[PDB]
């Protein structure tokens, strides 16, 4: 089992780095792909790339070795980098949802409103919020719990467990995950509503001659909308649910499961290249980049 568990972690790093490098390459190398949406995809790909290169590898060792081997400063910095990139990843998914929603439902209002320079500011905000949720509280010890058992892991340089006070785990989880989740639900539900209402008008227009049914395009749109919310929620909801549970009755969920749920969230960073870069232009770019 533990032989297979380490081999699994290896490809998680490979899939993330391979995938996200390939996206960033495709966008930077192809003039056609340098659209406004793909500016946000670039932000996402960078965050997931740093997760693959630095965050997940150091995490892999901690599971295999059973202990932190790089000392207390690098435990903090690795944890800060982890939180930052997960926050920037999830908050960027939320921005993409909004971007696509406006691009689909109000395409003309969107073109004048969403400039490239306004997009650059949105991207910078996401990374600034990510930094202030992660580096500022973790390096300055605001995240620290008072409990004696927690204080034993903070002093031990071999221990790098992710233990926090109440306020931080609530505020950090809401800003990094739950607000982004709700916005994404709200936004994508309005895409479904706008589509459903549009079919109702087409049925009304016919003067009782036809009733529209879900064609090939509508089933694909609904399946695509399912993958987006489904994979995002499956990968991160369990971890972030348990992260709040730990703040109250900490003995309820075992440590091995909470760790396993964290690996599921890291796997999201491998999924995003596959979910968000399926366009014809991306497929042409990927073939060209692989000779």
């Amino acid at each position, epitope marked *: 089992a533990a032989k297979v568990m380490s081999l699994l972690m290896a490809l998680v790093v490979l899939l993330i780095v391979a995938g996200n490098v390939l996206v960033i390459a495709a966008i930077g190398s192809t003039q056609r792909l340098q659209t406004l949406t793909n500016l946000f995809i670039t932000s996402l790909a960078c965050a997931d790339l740093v997760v693959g290169l630095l965050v997940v590898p150091f995490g892999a060792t901690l599971v295999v070795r059973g202990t932190w081997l790089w000392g207390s400063f690098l435990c903090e910095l690795w944890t800060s980098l982890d939180v930052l990139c997960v926050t920037a990843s999830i908050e960027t998914l939320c921005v993409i949802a909004i971007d*696509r929603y406006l*691009a689909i*439902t109000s*395409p*003309f209002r969107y073109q004048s409103l969403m400039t490239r320079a306004r997009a650059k500011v949105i991207i910078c905000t996401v990374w600034a919020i990510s930094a202030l949720v992660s580096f500022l509280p973790i390096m300055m010890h605001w995240w620290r719990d008072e409990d004696p058992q927690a204080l034993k892991c903070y002093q031990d340089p071999g221990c790098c467990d992710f233990v926090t006070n109440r306020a931080y785990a609530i505020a950090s989880s809401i800003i990094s995950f739950y607000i982004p989740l709700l916005i994404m639900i709200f936004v994508y539900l309005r*895409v479904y509503r706008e589509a459903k209402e549009q079919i109702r008008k*087409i049925d009304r227009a*016919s003067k009782r001659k036809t009733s529209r049914v879900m064609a090939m395009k509508e089933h694909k749109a609904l399946k*695509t909308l399912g993958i987006i919310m489904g994979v995002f929620t499956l990968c991160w909801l369990p971890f972030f649910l348990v992260n709040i549970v730990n703040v109250f009755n900490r003995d309820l969920v075992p440590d091995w499961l909470f760790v396993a749920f964290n690996w599921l969230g890291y796997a999201n960073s491998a999924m995003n290249p596959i979910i968000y870069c399926r366009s014809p232009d991306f497929r042409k770019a990927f073939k060209r980049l692989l000779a």
Partner: nanobody
Amino acid sequence: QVQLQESGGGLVQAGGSLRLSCAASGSIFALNIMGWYRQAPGKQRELVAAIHSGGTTNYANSVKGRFTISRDNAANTVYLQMNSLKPEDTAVYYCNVKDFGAIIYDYDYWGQGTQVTVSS
């Protein structure tokens, strides 16, 4: 397969009017933009007019107040009522459908084109 069928073009006198019409057959996602582009000889393809499924519109400045884009409430058909034509409006006019069915990216369909020649 999706196909765009263009009609209503041809020769016409300056100050006259045409009514282009593009009937899109096949599965199109309910959220989309049907539009008209044009390519005058030895120039680049420009937008003329576009109408979103919702109802909002977008016109180029050269044709504002003269042209009018509308669409069939029932089927996927888009009309361009061109009034007060000038010799500058002479071009191959292309129908275009931007389909939003993939959510993350838009898929494009182009018609073959239809000639519109405006003489003085």
